[PDB]
Amino acid sequence: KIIVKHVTVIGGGLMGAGIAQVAAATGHTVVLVDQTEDILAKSKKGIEESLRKVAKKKFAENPKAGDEFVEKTLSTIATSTDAASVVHSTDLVVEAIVENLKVKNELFKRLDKFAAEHTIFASNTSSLQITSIANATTRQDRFAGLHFFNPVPVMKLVQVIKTPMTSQKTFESLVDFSKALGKHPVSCKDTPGFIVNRLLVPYLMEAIRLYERGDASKEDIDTAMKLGAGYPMGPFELLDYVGLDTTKFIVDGWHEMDAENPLHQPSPSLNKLVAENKFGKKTGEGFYKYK
């Protein structure tokens, strides 16, 4: 029954940076890992802009206390491009890299050799089966799903996924950690997309199809969902906010593992965008061009 104090987040993108930000802000020492130094520089820079927004709103009467919160938080986030060494003595690895089983397995198979024994492994995968990733190691009793929601600083939900192999203690540690993060942990079964994505993705793909089918425009479909269903963001807005590349990988994956389910039919428009390197707010352009 370990207590997560030292955390290693592999992946500094939309999710990693946020998970690192929250772990840091809530008193956990964090080491954010990524491929290059420029990437890490950008990530930590972004985490800073996110903290300032929080500061400028939370500490308007005492700005000096706001700078401390920001500095103290950024300070509790170390950067490194060497997962192998960092995990040597970490309490928990939270993998948030490209949505691709092969890559993720290769990653954990390696880290399984370098990481300490009490170390807990966790994937933030959207559509991959935890069991499938946990078996790329020999640490399945310490491997589980730990799913966050974009933007991590705002979304309160966290999905804690056990595999038939995950231990109760591993589970509890991830549950306590989740809480110490100020989130609302929810145990799910290891089913594709778990809960949210299994329902949310096919929907977003349906919005894309309704657009390709020529029945309406993205703008009207977005206004529709926001003003009619009360959603915070329209379908096309959310897609660009999540990342078209991540979205596409989630679908191709499901498509491949169930090629006769029309829900997961890849999209021509989605593939074209990702093929031209337009992934949304990520690259400044997706379905909508951003400033």
Ligand X SMILES: NC(=O)c1ccc[n+]([C@@H]2O[C@H](COP(=O)([O-])OP(=O)(O)OC[C@H]3O[C@@H](n4cnc5c(N)ncnc54)[C@H](O)[C@@H]3O)[C@@H](O)[C@H]2O)c1
Ligand Y SMILES: CC(=O)CC(=O)SCCNC(=O)CCNC(=O)[C@H](O)C(C)(C)COP(=O)(O)OP(=O)(O)OC[C@H]1O[C@@H](n2cnc3c(N)ncnc32)[C@H](O)[C@@H]1OP(=O)(O)O
Binding-site positions read 11-16, 34, 50, 57, 99, 104, 126, 150, 282
Pairing of strands 92-95, 157-161: unpaired
Token pair, residue 17, equals 């940076």
Q: Residues 150-179 vs a second copy: string with x where CB under 8 A? A: -----xxx-x--------------------
In angstroms, the CA 188 to CA 160 distance is 6
In angstroms, the CA 146 to CA 152 distance is 12
56 binds, among a second copy, ligand Y, ligand X, none (CB under 5 to 8 A by kind): none
In angstroms, the CA 171 to CA 70 distance is 31
Nearest C-alpha neighbor of 6 from the set 84, 89, 72: 89
Write down the least CB distance from residue 92 to ligand Y, Å: 19
Number of Cβ atoms within 10 Å of the Cβ of 62: 10
User: CA gyration radius for the chain?
Assistant: 19
96 binds, among ligand X, ligand Y, a second copy, none (CB under 5 to 8 A by kind): ligand X
Which CB atom, from 150 or from 271, has the smaller least distance to ligand X?
Answer: 150
53 binds, among ligand X, ligand Y, a second copy, none (CB under 5 to 8 A by kind): ligand Y
What single DSSP character describes residue 140?
G
153 binds, among ligand X, ligand Y, a second copy, none (CB under 5 to 8 A by kind): ligand Y
Q: Supply φ then ψ for residue 95, to 5 degrees.
A: -85, 120
Which CB atom, from 6 or from 226, has the smaller least distance to a second copy?
Answer: 226
Write down the least CB distance from residue 101 to a second copy, Å: 20
Query: Which residues carry a binding-site annotation for NAD(+)?
Result: 11-16, 34, 99, 104, 126, 150, 282
User: Would you count residue 103 as binding ligand Y (CB under 6 A)?
Assistant: no
